[PDB]
Amino acid sequence: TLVKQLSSNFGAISSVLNDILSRLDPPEAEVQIDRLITGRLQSLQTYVT
Amino acid sequence: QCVNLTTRTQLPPAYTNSFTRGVYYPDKVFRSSVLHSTQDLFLPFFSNVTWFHAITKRFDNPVLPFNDGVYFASTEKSNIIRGWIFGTTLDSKTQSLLIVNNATNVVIKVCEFQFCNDPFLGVYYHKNNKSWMESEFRVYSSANNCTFEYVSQPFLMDLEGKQGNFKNLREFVFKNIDGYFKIYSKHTPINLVRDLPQGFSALEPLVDLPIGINITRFQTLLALHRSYLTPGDSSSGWTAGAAAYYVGYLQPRTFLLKYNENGTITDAVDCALDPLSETKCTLKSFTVEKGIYQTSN
Amino acid sequence: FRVQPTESIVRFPNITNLCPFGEVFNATRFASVYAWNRKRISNCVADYSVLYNSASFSTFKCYGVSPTKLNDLCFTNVYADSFVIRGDEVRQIAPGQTGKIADYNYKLPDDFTGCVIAWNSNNLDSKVGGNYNYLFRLFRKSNLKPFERDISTEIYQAGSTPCNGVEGFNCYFPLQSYGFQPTNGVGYQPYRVVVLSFELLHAPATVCGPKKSTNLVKNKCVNFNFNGLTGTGVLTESNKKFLPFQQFGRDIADTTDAVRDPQTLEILDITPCSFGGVSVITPGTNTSNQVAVLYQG
Amino acid sequence: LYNSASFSTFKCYGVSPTKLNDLCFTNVYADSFVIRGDEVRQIAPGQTG
Ligand SMILES: *[C@@H]1O[C@H](CO)[C@@H](O)[C@H](O)[C@H]1NC(C)=O
Ligand SMILES: *[C@@H]1O[C@H](CO)[C@@H](O)[C@H](O)[C@H]1NC(C)=O
Ligand SMILES: *[C@@H]1O[C@H](CO)[C@@H](O)[C@H](O)[C@H]1NC(C)=O
Ligand SMILES: *[C@@H]1O[C@H](CO)[C@@H](O)[C@H](O)[C@H]1NC(C)=O
């Protein structure tokens, strides 16, 4: 489940950071990267608990 | 140019069952030793597919509907079925797709066509030699505009009128999504005169022609066998031949697919067929052990 | 612990064609907004930078992509829609913006990716007598779906009174003309709009920017760029039996672990570079200052 | 008013007569007068005379 949780968009345009960074300028890329970071942090916390 | 064929005793077509047939590769990603679940347009398992007999005077080339996709299977030995026509009205007021297999040309034209009341291909026994060619190739009147006249190399196929026990199965899937007319095809040898064989085969992609036209109906082109016994008039003057073809329709279904080590799809599960199938789809396995499992709400 | 890449390699298909962007942008006739034309672009090399600084375009907005990075991406089947619209309605061509022209004419999806380009045509497309050749739909029963064209003209019926085609009370012609005249202000000056629409590649892609290809390097930790697929790893020959329609592979975790070279058409494994944790064994800083280091796995 | 209006000109600007029922205003003002038929064109939001 922790490995499968790496293919969720969490509201972003994509679940791949390389695709986001190769299509958007930094000021617009940070907005999607924040959503990805939030989702992945939540998944890690659930696994640890 | 048009003719009105007569002397055709229309009968209610028979119905048969498609057992585990019509599965295709849903994407170009290579997979191996994995169970993958996909949601797409598929032919449901154990579905009812109508049966047409092209062999008194039981001859049928009606204008079937085109509902979200069509599964087409034909079992023959003499290549009676050449191609299909696709379109909305077939009245030269709209672009109509065309696919034909003939040695002289394989018109894959996408042009407005004035299709006759009975679009057909006539293979006639000539007198100078045993040469076979279209008797009335003017299935249309004129192409006002051609958008995708992407004629490929003319397919070299033998032309003859003969009847015998069927030897090969050709299966096809037609889809029209996002301006793409996708075709998936297969060829497996079988020797039966009964209904569709019970087996699992996965159809591999053939072409992805981007015609981008509106399609609502479709009809099959069939080789009419004009002989010396028949008067030759384009109302009743032709011979029977032996052929059989089936039609099924695709619906939105979720399937669980199995890939072997070589990467071929060897089995599938239709989730909505049975509660047992839902249990298999939930557990992501083809085998279920003793117990009680919650599957839905 | 991380192993760092030594170099970078980029591999693009060898296509010498140049995309016909010139003819689409400045042609003799541009259609009206209610009936827009669509041009499909494929199998060529596109240089968007020259379009970015060709002429003083009134607006160049890109959604879902950045104009500077458009030169390094590969797409499939680029579309191009051109029409003539009033100056004040340009703001409604952006995705998600409600308005008259968005509701009853050209409408973009919420998840639109692409660039919208407009420029001023008052110098040429502004007749002193008045340009009435451009129409628009003012009445419609319901809202248009995204990327839908309406070409059917019928008398709009308002209220309980039925029109019956008389075109009388409570009945109006759906189309309304334009009053583009040089005497009008800047807001009423016509603007030509071209919308480029991109779809991300899953099938093989041939619309790629002018990027030179480098030699392939194997068995080294290297950065690669395969038709836009970016990453880092070690490229090794593989025995996986890709089918002719398959271009890349995936594992259970759905990560690209194989790829096919666009030029030489060979199958390459992708293995991430070595990494692990580092542990330091110490006997206590009071006893001594010597340490030992363990590299995990 | 709109249905079976039998009025020479029932024109609404900035709003549709069919949709007037749904949205709610307050303090509606009703101004009435008598003009000539040829002066109807002058009674418009953006005309002169
Ligand atoms: C396609 O043809 C049908 C007629 O069968 C028509 O109702 C429909 O509006 C046409 N267009 C689309 C997009 O389906
Ligand atoms: C995979 O292909 C090899 C090569 O022909 C064959 O020997 C093997 O039996 C195949 N595996 C199957 C069919 O499961
Ligand atoms: C059209 O645009 C291209 C690119 O800017 C330019 O080279 C060409 O001269 C233009 N043609 C006309 C007729 O303006
Ligand atoms: C160009 O690409 C083709 C693949 O379509 C390849 O066979 C050919 O060798 C390439 N030519 C060069 C000069 O790299």
PDB file of C-alpha atoms in Angstrom, chain C residues 41-258:
ATOM      1  CA  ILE C  41      -0.511  18.646 -37.239  1.00  0.00           C
ATOM      2  CA  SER C  42       1.650  15.532 -37.011  1.00  0.00           C
ATOM      3  CA  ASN C  43       4.983  14.001 -38.038  1.00  0.00           C
ATOM      4  CA  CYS C  44       7.177  17.098 -38.139  1.00  0.00           C
ATOM      5  CA  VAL C  45       9.582  19.260 -36.137  1.00  0.00           C
ATOM      6  CA  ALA C  46       7.970  22.226 -34.381  1.00  0.00           C
ATOM      7  CA  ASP C  47       9.912  25.332 -33.325  1.00  0.00           C
ATOM      8  CA  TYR C  48       7.641  27.247 -30.953  1.00  0.00           C
ATOM      9  CA  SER C  49      10.352  29.769 -30.035  1.00  0.00           C
ATOM     10  CA  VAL C  50      10.145  31.511 -33.413  1.00  0.00           C
ATOM     11  CA  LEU C  51       6.380  31.807 -32.897  1.00  0.00           C
ATOM     12  CA  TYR C  52       7.028  33.166 -29.394  1.00  0.00           C
ATOM     13  CA  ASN C  53       8.904  36.154 -30.876  1.00  0.00           C
ATOM     14  CA  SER C  54       7.666  36.368 -34.484  1.00  0.00           C
ATOM     15  CA  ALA C  55       5.284  39.329 -34.183  1.00  0.00           C
ATOM     16  CA  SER C  56       3.857  41.488 -31.399  1.00  0.00           C
ATOM     17  CA  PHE C  57       0.970  39.192 -30.532  1.00  0.00           C
ATOM     18  CA  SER C  58      -1.722  40.791 -28.391  1.00  0.00           C
ATOM     19  CA  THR C  59      -1.710  37.865 -25.951  1.00  0.00           C
ATOM     20  CA  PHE C  60       0.218  34.595 -25.586  1.00  0.00           C
ATOM     21  CA  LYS C  61      -1.217  32.548 -22.702  1.00  0.00           C
ATOM     22  CA  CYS C  62      -0.230  28.926 -22.065  1.00  0.00           C
ATOM     23  CA  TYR C  63      -2.082  26.676 -19.614  1.00  0.00           C
ATOM     24  CA  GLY C  64      -0.532  23.538 -18.155  1.00  0.00           C
ATOM     25  CA  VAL C  65       2.833  24.225 -19.817  1.00  0.00           C
ATOM     26  CA  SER C  66       5.482  26.936 -20.004  1.00  0.00           C
ATOM     27  CA  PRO C  67       6.378  28.611 -23.324  1.00  0.00           C
ATOM     28  CA  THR C  68      10.130  28.390 -22.696  1.00  0.00           C
ATOM     29  CA  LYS C  69       9.965  24.621 -22.097  1.00  0.00           C
ATOM     30  CA  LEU C  70       7.764  23.899 -25.137  1.00  0.00           C
ATOM     31  CA  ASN C  71      10.938  23.377 -27.187  1.00  0.00           C
ATOM     32  CA  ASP C  72      12.042  20.325 -25.161  1.00  0.00           C
ATOM     33  CA  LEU C  73       8.784  18.323 -25.126  1.00  0.00           C
ATOM     34  CA  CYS C  74       7.335  15.697 -27.464  1.00  0.00           C
ATOM     35  CA  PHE C  75       3.600  15.698 -28.231  1.00  0.00           C
ATOM     36  CA  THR C  76       1.144  13.804 -30.428  1.00  0.00           C
ATOM     37  CA  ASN C  77      -1.268  15.122 -33.080  1.00  0.00           C
ATOM     38  CA  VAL C  78      -1.127  18.845 -32.368  1.00  0.00           C
ATOM     39  CA  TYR C  79      -4.409  20.612 -33.121  1.00  0.00           C
ATOM     40  CA  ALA C  80      -4.947  24.209 -34.230  1.00  0.00           C
ATOM     41  CA  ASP C  81      -8.268  26.084 -34.112  1.00  0.00           C
ATOM     42  CA  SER C  82      -8.573  29.527 -35.718  1.00  0.00           C
ATOM     43  CA  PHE C  83     -11.471  31.990 -35.642  1.00  0.00           C
ATOM     44  CA  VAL C  84     -12.247  35.715 -35.542  1.00  0.00           C
ATOM     45  CA  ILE C  85     -13.763  37.169 -32.363  1.00  0.00           C
ATOM     46  CA  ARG C  86     -14.467  40.565 -30.834  1.00  0.00           C
ATOM     47  CA  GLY C  87     -11.802  42.127 -28.645  1.00  0.00           C
ATOM     48  CA  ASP C  88     -13.910  42.179 -25.478  1.00  0.00           C
ATOM     49  CA  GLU C  89     -14.668  38.430 -25.636  1.00  0.00           C
ATOM     50  CA  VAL C  90     -11.027  37.273 -25.699  1.00  0.00           C
ATOM     51  CA  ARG C  91     -11.081  36.864 -21.908  1.00  0.00           C
ATOM     52  CA  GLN C  92     -13.771  34.180 -22.262  1.00  0.00           C
ATOM     53  CA  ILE C  93     -11.474  31.963 -24.367  1.00  0.00           C
ATOM     54  CA  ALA C  94      -9.533  31.042 -21.215  1.00  0.00           C
ATOM     55  CA  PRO C  95     -10.500  27.737 -19.560  1.00  0.00           C
ATOM     56  CA  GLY C  96     -13.163  27.867 -16.874  1.00  0.00           C
ATOM     57  CA  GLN C  97     -14.381  31.380 -17.747  1.00  0.00           C
ATOM     58  CA  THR C  98     -18.132  31.653 -18.261  1.00  0.00           C
ATOM     59  CA  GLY C  99     -19.533  33.999 -20.873  1.00  0.00           C
ATOM     60  CA  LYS C 100     -21.632  34.333 -23.993  1.00  0.00           C
ATOM     61  CA  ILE C 101     -19.041  33.053 -26.467  1.00  0.00           C
ATOM     62  CA  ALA C 102     -17.937  30.306 -24.073  1.00  0.00           C
ATOM     63  CA  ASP C 103     -21.506  29.177 -23.387  1.00  0.00           C
ATOM     64  CA  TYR C 104     -22.892  29.123 -26.936  1.00  0.00           C
ATOM     65  CA  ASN C 105     -19.683  28.802 -29.008  1.00  0.00           C
ATOM     66  CA  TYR C 106     -16.064  27.593 -28.669  1.00  0.00           C
ATOM     67  CA  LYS C 107     -15.509  26.212 -25.158  1.00  0.00           C
ATOM     68  CA  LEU C 108     -12.316  24.895 -23.587  1.00  0.00           C
ATOM     69  CA  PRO C 109     -12.167  22.077 -21.020  1.00  0.00           C
ATOM     70  CA  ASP C 110     -11.290  22.798 -17.409  1.00  0.00           C
ATOM     71  CA  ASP C 111      -8.158  20.633 -17.708  1.00  0.00           C
ATOM     72  CA  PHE C 112      -6.968  22.420 -20.842  1.00  0.00           C
ATOM     73  CA  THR C 113      -3.295  22.077 -21.779  1.00  0.00           C
ATOM     74  CA  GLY C 114      -1.985  24.258 -24.583  1.00  0.00           C
ATOM     75  CA  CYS C 115      -1.483  27.862 -25.627  1.00  0.00           C
ATOM     76  CA  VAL C 116      -3.971  30.491 -26.825  1.00  0.00           C
ATOM     77  CA  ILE C 117      -2.632  33.157 -29.200  1.00  0.00           C
ATOM     78  CA  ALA C 118      -4.386  36.302 -30.432  1.00  0.00           C
ATOM     79  CA  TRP C 119      -3.318  39.347 -32.431  1.00  0.00           C
ATOM     80  CA  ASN C 120      -4.860  42.501 -33.871  1.00  0.00           C
ATOM     81  CA  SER C 121      -6.313  42.367 -37.392  1.00  0.00           C
ATOM     82  CA  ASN C 122      -7.896  45.839 -37.506  1.00  0.00           C
ATOM     83  CA  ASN C 123      -5.290  46.978 -40.049  1.00  0.00           C
ATOM     84  CA  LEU C 124      -6.606  44.528 -42.670  1.00  0.00           C
ATOM     85  CA  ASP C 125      -9.842  42.887 -41.463  1.00  0.00           C
ATOM     86  CA  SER C 126     -11.719  46.153 -40.807  1.00  0.00           C
ATOM     87  CA  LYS C 127     -13.764  47.341 -43.783  1.00  0.00           C
ATOM     88  CA  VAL C 128     -14.950  50.947 -43.779  1.00  0.00           C
ATOM     89  CA  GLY C 129     -18.329  49.842 -45.146  1.00  0.00           C
ATOM     90  CA  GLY C 130     -18.680  47.199 -42.425  1.00  0.00           C
ATOM     91  CA  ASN C 131     -17.732  43.531 -42.158  1.00  0.00           C
ATOM     92  CA  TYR C 132     -20.917  41.456 -41.907  1.00  0.00           C
ATOM     93  CA  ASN C 133     -19.399  38.177 -43.154  1.00  0.00           C
ATOM     94  CA  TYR C 134     -18.689  37.038 -39.571  1.00  0.00           C
ATOM     95  CA  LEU C 135     -21.628  35.673 -37.570  1.00  0.00           C
ATOM     96  CA  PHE C 136     -22.153  34.215 -34.110  1.00  0.00           C
ATOM     97  CA  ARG C 137     -24.830  32.193 -32.330  1.00  0.00           C
ATOM     98  CA  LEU C 138     -26.790  34.292 -29.838  1.00  0.00           C
ATOM     99  CA  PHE C 139     -29.592  31.877 -28.846  1.00  0.00           C
ATOM    100  CA  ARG C 140     -29.183  28.248 -27.807  1.00  0.00           C
ATOM    101  CA  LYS C 141     -31.340  25.875 -25.780  1.00  0.00           C
ATOM    102  CA  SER C 142     -28.545  24.409 -23.631  1.00  0.00           C
ATOM    103  CA  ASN C 143     -24.855  24.847 -22.856  1.00  0.00           C
ATOM    104  CA  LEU C 144     -22.255  23.546 -25.293  1.00  0.00           C
ATOM    105  CA  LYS C 145     -19.982  20.703 -24.256  1.00  0.00           C
ATOM    106  CA  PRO C 146     -16.216  21.324 -24.438  1.00  0.00           C
ATOM    107  CA  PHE C 147     -14.722  21.185 -27.944  1.00  0.00           C
ATOM    108  CA  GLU C 148     -18.116  20.974 -29.664  1.00  0.00           C
ATOM    109  CA  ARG C 149     -19.176  22.706 -32.884  1.00  0.00           C
ATOM    110  CA  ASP C 150     -22.742  23.653 -33.837  1.00  0.00           C
ATOM    111  CA  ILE C 151     -23.572  24.257 -37.502  1.00  0.00           C
ATOM    112  CA  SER C 152     -27.351  23.797 -37.351  1.00  0.00           C
ATOM    113  CA  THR C 153     -29.464  26.950 -37.664  1.00  0.00           C
ATOM    114  CA  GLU C 154     -33.042  26.836 -36.363  1.00  0.00           C
ATOM    115  CA  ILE C 155     -35.454  29.490 -35.134  1.00  0.00           C
ATOM    116  CA  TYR C 156     -35.241  29.832 -31.355  1.00  0.00           C
ATOM    117  CA  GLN C 157     -38.555  29.475 -29.510  1.00  0.00           C
ATOM    118  CA  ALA C 158     -39.066  31.540 -26.350  1.00  0.00           C
ATOM    119  CA  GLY C 159     -42.159  31.127 -24.197  1.00  0.00           C
ATOM    120  CA  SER C 160     -45.177  28.910 -24.693  1.00  0.00           C
ATOM    121  CA  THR C 161     -45.863  30.250 -28.195  1.00  0.00           C
ATOM    122  CA  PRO C 162     -44.602  27.758 -30.811  1.00  0.00           C
ATOM    123  CA  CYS C 163     -42.525  29.226 -33.620  1.00  0.00           C
ATOM    124  CA  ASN C 164     -43.513  26.654 -36.282  1.00  0.00           C
ATOM    125  CA  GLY C 165     -40.930  28.302 -38.544  1.00  0.00           C
ATOM    126  CA  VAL C 166     -42.904  31.527 -39.040  1.00  0.00           C
ATOM    127  CA  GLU C 167     -40.047  33.544 -37.473  1.00  0.00           C
ATOM    128  CA  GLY C 168     -42.461  35.993 -35.882  1.00  0.00           C
ATOM    129  CA  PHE C 169     -43.294  36.927 -32.300  1.00  0.00           C
ATOM    130  CA  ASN C 170     -40.996  35.344 -29.694  1.00  0.00           C
ATOM    131  CA  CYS C 171     -38.970  33.879 -32.578  1.00  0.00           C
ATOM    132  CA  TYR C 172     -35.479  35.027 -33.543  1.00  0.00           C
ATOM    133  CA  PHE C 173     -32.756  33.889 -35.909  1.00  0.00           C
ATOM    134  CA  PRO C 174     -29.964  32.263 -33.848  1.00  0.00           C
ATOM    135  CA  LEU C 175     -27.167  33.932 -35.833  1.00  0.00           C
ATOM    136  CA  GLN C 176     -26.260  37.585 -35.278  1.00  0.00           C
ATOM    137  CA  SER C 177     -23.800  39.603 -37.338  1.00  0.00           C
ATOM    138  CA  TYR C 178     -20.765  41.725 -36.452  1.00  0.00           C
ATOM    139  CA  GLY C 179     -20.175  45.443 -36.868  1.00  0.00           C
ATOM    140  CA  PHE C 180     -16.406  45.628 -37.299  1.00  0.00           C
ATOM    141  CA  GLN C 181     -15.727  49.143 -38.586  1.00  0.00           C
ATOM    142  CA  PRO C 182     -12.607  51.321 -38.264  1.00  0.00           C
ATOM    143  CA  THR C 183     -14.738  54.048 -36.662  1.00  0.00           C
ATOM    144  CA  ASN C 184     -15.375  51.726 -33.705  1.00  0.00           C
ATOM    145  CA  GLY C 185     -13.149  51.749 -30.647  1.00  0.00           C
ATOM    146  CA  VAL C 186     -10.357  49.343 -29.794  1.00  0.00           C
ATOM    147  CA  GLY C 187     -12.740  47.140 -27.816  1.00  0.00           C
ATOM    148  CA  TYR C 188     -14.841  46.462 -30.920  1.00  0.00           C
ATOM    149  CA  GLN C 189     -11.848  45.864 -33.202  1.00  0.00           C
ATOM    150  CA  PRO C 190     -11.707  42.234 -34.393  1.00  0.00           C
ATOM    151  CA  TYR C 191      -8.920  39.977 -33.130  1.00  0.00           C
ATOM    152  CA  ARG C 192      -7.752  36.762 -34.777  1.00  0.00           C
ATOM    153  CA  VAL C 193      -7.351  33.901 -32.288  1.00  0.00           C
ATOM    154  CA  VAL C 194      -5.399  30.664 -32.773  1.00  0.00           C
ATOM    155  CA  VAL C 195      -5.609  27.958 -30.099  1.00  0.00           C
ATOM    156  CA  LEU C 196      -2.980  25.210 -29.958  1.00  0.00           C
ATOM    157  CA  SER C 197      -4.080  22.053 -28.134  1.00  0.00           C
ATOM    158  CA  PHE C 198      -1.604  19.399 -27.004  1.00  0.00           C
ATOM    159  CA  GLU C 199      -2.262  15.869 -25.773  1.00  0.00           C
ATOM    160  CA  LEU C 200       0.344  13.994 -23.756  1.00  0.00           C
ATOM    161  CA  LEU C 201       2.031  11.022 -25.400  1.00  0.00           C
ATOM    162  CA  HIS C 202       1.208   7.391 -24.680  1.00  0.00           C
ATOM    163  CA  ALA C 203       1.333   6.112 -28.253  1.00  0.00           C
ATOM    164  CA  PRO C 204       4.577   6.771 -30.162  1.00  0.00           C
ATOM    165  CA  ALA C 205       5.040  10.507 -30.669  1.00  0.00           C
ATOM    166  CA  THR C 206       6.506  12.201 -33.743  1.00  0.00           C
ATOM    167  CA  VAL C 207       5.804  15.893 -33.017  1.00  0.00           C
ATOM    168  CA  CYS C 208       9.055  16.806 -31.258  1.00  0.00           C
ATOM    169  CA  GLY C 209      11.129  19.945 -30.900  1.00  0.00           C
ATOM    170  CA  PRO C 210      14.502  20.436 -32.620  1.00  0.00           C
ATOM    171  CA  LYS C 211      16.771  18.657 -30.136  1.00  0.00           C
ATOM    172  CA  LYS C 212      19.952  16.965 -31.325  1.00  0.00           C
ATOM    173  CA  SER C 213      20.505  13.315 -30.436  1.00  0.00           C
ATOM    174  CA  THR C 214      23.594  11.964 -28.680  1.00  0.00           C
ATOM    175  CA  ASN C 215      25.285   8.576 -28.726  1.00  0.00           C
ATOM    176  CA  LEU C 216      23.908   5.818 -26.511  1.00  0.00           C
ATOM    177  CA  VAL C 217      25.940   4.815 -23.447  1.00  0.00           C
ATOM    178  CA  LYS C 218      25.396   1.564 -21.542  1.00  0.00           C
ATOM    179  CA  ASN C 219      26.465   0.176 -18.154  1.00  0.00           C
ATOM    180  CA  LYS C 220      27.026   3.635 -16.625  1.00  0.00           C
ATOM    181  CA  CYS C 221      24.991   5.769 -14.232  1.00  0.00           C
ATOM    182  CA  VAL C 222      23.629   8.308 -16.722  1.00  0.00           C
ATOM    183  CA  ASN C 223      20.749  10.719 -17.247  1.00  0.00           C
ATOM    184  CA  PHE C 224      18.548   9.860 -20.225  1.00  0.00           C
ATOM    185  CA  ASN C 225      15.805  11.563 -22.256  1.00  0.00           C
ATOM    186  CA  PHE C 226      13.759   9.111 -24.353  1.00  0.00           C
ATOM    187  CA  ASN C 227      11.049  11.065 -26.214  1.00  0.00           C
ATOM    188  CA  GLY C 228      10.530  13.203 -23.115  1.00  0.00           C
ATOM    189  CA  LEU C 229      10.872  10.320 -20.643  1.00  0.00           C
ATOM    190  CA  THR C 230      13.391  11.758 -18.174  1.00  0.00           C
ATOM    191  CA  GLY C 231      15.205   9.894 -15.426  1.00  0.00           C
ATOM    192  CA  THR C 232      18.459   8.443 -14.146  1.00  0.00           C
ATOM    193  CA  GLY C 233      19.731   4.881 -14.191  1.00  0.00           C
ATOM    194  CA  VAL C 234      21.891   2.250 -15.859  1.00  0.00           C
ATOM    195  CA  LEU C 235      20.909   1.153 -19.372  1.00  0.00           C
ATOM    196  CA  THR C 236      21.477  -2.543 -20.090  1.00  0.00           C
ATOM    197  CA  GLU C 237      20.474  -4.911 -22.877  1.00  0.00           C
ATOM    198  CA  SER C 238      17.373  -6.936 -22.011  1.00  0.00           C
ATOM    199  CA  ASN C 239      15.703 -10.137 -23.197  1.00  0.00           C
ATOM    200  CA  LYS C 240      12.096  -9.010 -22.640  1.00  0.00           C
ATOM    201  CA  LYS C 241       9.927  -9.970 -25.626  1.00  0.00           C
ATOM    202  CA  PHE C 242       8.344  -6.665 -26.583  1.00  0.00           C
ATOM    203  CA  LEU C 243       5.583  -7.002 -29.157  1.00  0.00           C
ATOM    204  CA  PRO C 244       5.902  -4.776 -32.250  1.00  0.00           C
ATOM    205  CA  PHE C 245       3.216  -2.347 -31.033  1.00  0.00           C
ATOM    206  CA  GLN C 246       4.799  -2.022 -27.560  1.00  0.00           C
ATOM    207  CA  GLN C 247       7.189   0.843 -26.804  1.00  0.00           C
ATOM    208  CA  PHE C 248       7.916   0.558 -23.059  1.00  0.00           C
ATOM    209  CA  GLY C 249       7.337  -1.757 -20.123  1.00  0.00           C
ATOM    210  CA  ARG C 250       6.266  -1.544 -16.483  1.00  0.00           C
ATOM    211  CA  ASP C 251       6.515  -3.568 -13.280  1.00  0.00           C
ATOM    212  CA  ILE C 252       4.011  -4.357 -10.520  1.00  0.00           C
ATOM    213  CA  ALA C 253       4.657  -0.981  -8.862  1.00  0.00           C
ATOM    214  CA  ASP C 254       3.984   0.655 -12.272  1.00  0.00           C
ATOM    215  CA  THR C 255       7.462   2.086 -12.857  1.00  0.00           C
ATOM    216  CA  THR C 256       9.096   2.250 -16.285  1.00  0.00           C
ATOM    217  CA  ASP C 257      11.787  -0.450 -16.166  1.00  0.00           C
ATOM    218  CA  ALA C 258      12.198  -0.888 -19.937  1.00  0.00           C
TER     219      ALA C 258
END
